[PDB]
């Protein structure tokens, strides 16, 4: 399994702009709390904390950093679909649970 890290250059940077672009509810933070609550990835704030101080650099990206940690932590593409689509849903469910 090839891991986020990994994929070519181009294709993490489309990526990582693509999911600093979503709204908040589907963003790379929401994106880290749903893949930090597994055992096999852990993300603390503090871990987070590094990629949301990346936007103080002129053109940063948190989101590119998220991608690359999670990576690092063993995460897959199919993996990172996997999570986005729980992340739709869960959306979805949010907004209509009382």
């Known amino acids: 399994g090839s891991t986020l890290n990994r994929l070519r250059e181009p294709l993490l940077r489309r990526l990582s702009e693509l ?3 979503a ?3 589907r963003g790379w933070r ?3 709390e749903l893949a930090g609550s597994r055992g096999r990835l852990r993300l603390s704030c503090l871990d987070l904390e ?3 101080l ?6 940063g990206s948190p989101s590119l950093c998220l991608l690359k940690l999670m ?5 897959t ?6 999570f ?9 469910l949010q907004l209509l649970s009382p």
């Open 84 to 92: 986005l689509q729980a992340m739709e849903h869960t959306e979805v």
């Open 19 to 21: 999911l600093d672009q």
């Open 30 to 32: 929401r994106l880290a």
């Open 23 to 25: 709204p908040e509810g």
């Open 50 to 52: 590094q990629c949301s």
């Open 77 to 82: 593409v199919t993996e990172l679909s996997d």
């Open 71 to 75: 990576g690092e932590k063993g995460c």
């Open 54 to 59: 990346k936007v103080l650099e002129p053109e």
